[PDB]
Structure formats: C-alpha cells, structure tokens
Amino acid sequence: KKAIVRLSIPMMIGMSVQTLYNLADGIWVSGLGPESLAAVGLFFPVFMGIIALAAGLGVGTSSAIARRIGARDKEGADNVAVHSLILSLILGVTITITMLPAIDSLFRSMGAKGEAVELAIEYARVLLAGAFIIVFNNVGNGILRGEGDANRAMLAMVLGSGLNIVLDPIFIYTLGFGVVGAAYATLLSMVVTSLFIAYWLFVKRDTYVDITLRDFSPSREILKDILRVGLPSSLSQLSMSIAMFFLNSVAITAGGENGVAVFTSAWRITMLGIVPILGMAAATTSVTGAAYGERNVEKLETAYLYAIKIAFMIELAVVAFIMLFAPQVAYLFTYSESAQVIKGDLISALRTLPVFLVLTPFGMMTSAMFQGIGEGEKSLILTIFRTLVMQVGFAYIFVHYTTLGLRGVWIGIVIGNMVAAIVGFLWGRMRISALKKTSA
C-alpha cells in the first residue's frame, strides 16, 4: 500500500504479442531483398486490423462469460460461447469475401508499384483465405480466458508464434516458396494453435463452459453484451492499423518501396521498446483504481507519477541501446547482399525513430490512470488522436513541405508522439486537480 505496489504488481507474468508473427515474417523475408521485405510490410496494417476486430471480439466474449460464470449461470455461459463462435464464422467469412477482391486496389491506392505489390498480393491472398483461422484463435482464446483457463490459452499462442519462427526459414528458403512461404508458415502455425484451442474447448474434461448447441438460444442481449466490451477495445488497435496504412503511403512518396522496407523494419523494432513498460501500465490501472475506490487522491497521484519516473528510466535504457547498437539490430534485416541497399537508411531510422519513447511514459501512464478511475473513454480518445491525427499528420507535413525525405517520416512520428504525449499528460494533470478539489 505505497509506491512499492507498482513494482510488486508490474511483474509481466507472460503476455500476448501476436505481432511476433509479423516481426518473424519480416526478419526471414528481408534476406530475399527489400522488395520482399516491403511486400510483407504493406500487409502488416491489414493483418493487424484483422487481429483488432478478432481480438476485440474475444475480449467481449471473456467479459460476458466471466460475469455469467460468476453469476452462477451455466446455460448462459454456454450460450455466450456458442454466440461468439458464430460471430467468428460470420467475421472470418466476411473478411475473405470483402478483402480478396479489394486487396489489389488497396495496395495500389497508396502508390505502391513494382514487384512489391505482386509479392504483397501473393502474401495477402493466402492469409486472407485463412482469415477464419485467425479469428477463431482470438475468439477461442477469449472463451478460455473467460472460464479461467487463461493459462492454457497462453501456451497455444506462444506455441504458434514460436513455431512460425522455426517454420519461416524452412518454407521460404528450404522448400523454395519465397515470400508466399512466410504466409504458409503463419497459416500452418495458427492451425496448430487452433488445434490446441479446440482440444481444450471440446475434448478436455472438467471445463466450466460446455460448448453444446442444446443451450444455444439466440438472444439479442448477448450480442450487445459482447460488442459493448469488444468494440471499444478493438477500436484502439484498429486506429493503429489505419495509421500504419497511411504511414506506409507517406513512406512510399518519401523513399519508394525501400522506404517502406526501412519503415516497417524500424517500426517493428521500435514497438518492442514499449514492452518493458507495459507491465507498469497495467499495474498503474490496478493501483490508481484501488486508490480511487478508497477515494484517496494523494495516493492516486503518487502512484501514477512514480510509474512515469520508473518507465522513463527504463525507456532511456531502451533508446540508448537502440541508438548505440543500431548496426547490430539492423543486421536482422540486412544480413544478405540483396538487402545492403537499405542498410544505411535502416540504421539512420533506428537512431531517430525510437526517440519518442522517452516521452511515451508521460502519455501511456496517464491513459492507464484514466482507465483506473473509470474514465477509459479519455484513454481511447488519446490513442486515436495520437496515431491518426498526430503521427500521420506530422509525417505528412515533413514529407510534402520539407526536403528531409525519409528522415522527415521519422521526425514526424517522433514529434507527433511527443505532442500527443504532452497534451495527454496535461489532460491527466487537469483531471487530477479536478479530483483533488472534490473534497466538499
């Protein structure tokens, strides 16, 4: 019950990062060349957008199952499980029918030409055809988290992403499939994950949720119970996916296809920099919310200001590590002769892009404080305002109205994130003083 409650609760006891599919797909494909590395990079926003809707649908399922198991309603929990699986079928089918005829015009809309589009279409149509496998893994994970089997669902996700790291160089180079082999390795890895999930959902004994069609009564209330929790969650990741789509377009006008290869490589490396501070963000919500339940604003401010000071020191080490060891980190994407043309530009991006990570704790821990005091809507507004308005806005300005070129893209993302981190932190200071004045 002090400042030690932040360190004693921010342990990060395992996490869920499905982007390691994209990071492993990027490292193993970059050996073929920048045209291939840019091809998978053009589809990462779409792959991330499908994850957003799917993982959001599973989040709403976990909430509806947990409160129905806690309310001692067995058939209600079984009914929610059947409803979410039908929604995953409708969602998986809709994405396949919609995105297949529109994926060509989507890549070509953002100025992507050359062979990078043809390689992206090959890589996209395979993953889009297996979109049901992707949505089932997220909704199936949601059902396991709702009934308490969150540990077993965590192993299936780690097994899939880890198996894709091994299966990537086999399908791409050994079997000679090339860029489309990375899509096969992702599809094959998630089917193995789907088999584990389906085992604990249908075959394993002594599960509190029995997915049987005898309890399926189509209730319109269950539909909005899943969407009430899922849609706000998916809207956060969906905002990031849309931003990466337009940031890929800005990178094309700034440096062509090699600009996307450099961007999609440094962006995946920079997104790993916020991983050490993720545990402090989830811990800040738990501590500030506990202090808000006690209505102790003094402990509330001390908790979330201490999380910023610790996360700032951690991010200083992350920024210093990436700037110092940039040519070693960039070797993960430039380990072949064909990839040497982007070696110099990738090292320059790794010493300019991760600069905004030092101000991220000021904005991320404030949004975590908002979610603890029941004002999670403000946390969703800040992320949409950061990724869409500020990231894409400044990057667009530094490219069309300055001569910085590729470096204009990185400076825009840094300034765009810092400006959003300041106004978000200032919004928290405004809200903290509003709660302090709530004394009479």
Residue 119: what are its φ and ψ, rounded to 5°?
-70, -30
Give the chain's length.
Answer: 440
Q: Is the CB of residue 3 less than 8 Å from the CB of residue 308?
A: no
Distance of alpha carbon 316 from alpha carbon 296, whole angstroms? 31
Distance of alpha carbon 259 from alpha carbon 31, whole angstroms? 16
Report the SS3 class of residue 205.
coil
- For tokens 């599809």, the residue is 187
List the domain boundaries for the chain: 1-440
Distance of alpha carbon 374 from alpha carbon 291, whole angstroms? 12
Distance of alpha carbon 437 from alpha carbon 250, whole angstroms? 45
The residue type at 163:
L
Q: Is the CB of residue 90 less than 8 Å from the CB of residue 57?
A: no
Q: Is the CB of residue 201 less than 8 Å from the CB of residue 140?
A: yes
3-state helix, strand, coil in the chain (%, to 5): 85, 0, 15
Q: Is the CB of residue 44 less than 8 Å from the CB of residue 29?
A: no
Name, in order, each residue with C-beta under 8 angstroms of 349's C-beta and a sequence gap of 6 or more: 262, 263, 265, 266, 406, 410
Find, among 283, 300, 277, the residue nearest to 429 by Cα.
300
CA 105, chain centre distance (Å): 25
- For tokens 């990375």, the residue is 182
The token pair that represents 181 in the structure block = 């082999």
Q: Where are the extended beta strands (E) located within 36-127? A: none
Residue 438: what are its φ and ψ, rounded to 5°?
-85, 75
| Positive or negative: CA dihedral 408, 413, 417, 418 | negative
The token pair that represents 239 in the structure block = 């905002």
Distance of alpha carbon 290 from alpha carbon 305, whole angstroms? 15
Q: Is the CB of residue 94 less than 8 Å from the CB of residue 132?
A: no
Q: What is the CA radius of gyration of the chain?
A: 22
Task: Give the experimental resolution in Å.
Answer: 2.8
Half-sphere exposure of 169 (CA within 13 A, CB side): 7
3-class SS letters over the chain:
CCCHHHHCCCCCCCCCCCCHHHHHHHHHHHHHCHHHHHHHHHHHHHHHHHHHHHHHHHHHHHHHHHHHHHCCCHHHHHHHHHHHHHHHHHHHHHHHHHHHHHHHHHHCCCCCCHHHHHHHHHHHHHHHHCHHHHHHHHHHHHHHHHCCCHHHHHHHHHHHHHHHHHHHHHHHHHCCCCHHHHHHHHHHHHHHHHHHHHHHHHHCCCCCCCCCHHHCCCCHHHHHHHHHHHHHHHHHHHHHHHHHHHHHHHHHHHHCHHHHHHHHHHHHHHHHHHCCCHHHHHHHHHHHHHHHHCCCHHHHHHHHHHHHHHHHHHHHHHHHHHHHCHHHHHHHCCCCCCCHHHHHHHHHHHCCHHHHHHCHHHHHHHHHHHHHCCCHHHHHHHHHHHHHHHHHHHHHHHHHCCCCCHHHHHHHHHHHHHHHHHHHHHHHHHHHHHHHCCCC
Cα separations in angstroms, 375 against 227, 228, 380? 19, 15, 9
Name, in order, each residue with C-beta under 8 angstroms of 325's C-beta and a sequence gap of 6 or more: none
Distance of alpha carbon 120 from alpha carbon 179, whole angstroms? 8
3-class SS letters over 298-358:
HHHHHHHHHHHHHHHHHHHHHHHHHHHCHHHHHHHCCCCCCCHHHHHHHHHHHCCHHHHHH
Would you state the torsion angle of the CA atoms of residues 54, 56, 60, 63, taken in this order, to the nearest 10 degrees?
110
The token pair that represents 15 in the structure block = 């996490």
Q: Is the CB of residue 90 less than 8 Å from the CB of residue 131?
A: no
- For tokens 């067995």, the residue is 74
Q: Is 77 exposed, middle or buried (0-12, 13-18, 19+ CB in 10 A)?
A: buried
The token pair that represents 382 in the structure block = 């800040």
The token pair that represents 341 in the structure block = 């043309």
Q: Is the CB of residue 404 less than 8 Å from the CB of residue 398?
A: yes
Any idea what DSSP says for residue 165? H
Name, in order, each residue with C-beta under 8 angstroms of 372's C-beta and a sequence gap of 6 or more: 284, 285, 286, 287, 288, 289, 292, 300
Cα separations in angstroms, 77 against 85, 100, 229, 431? 13, 35, 16, 38
The token pair that represents 407 in the structure block = 């470096």
Distance of alpha carbon 377 from alpha carbon 375, whole angstroms? 5
Q: Is the CB of residue 267 less than 8 Å from the CB of residue 391?
A: no
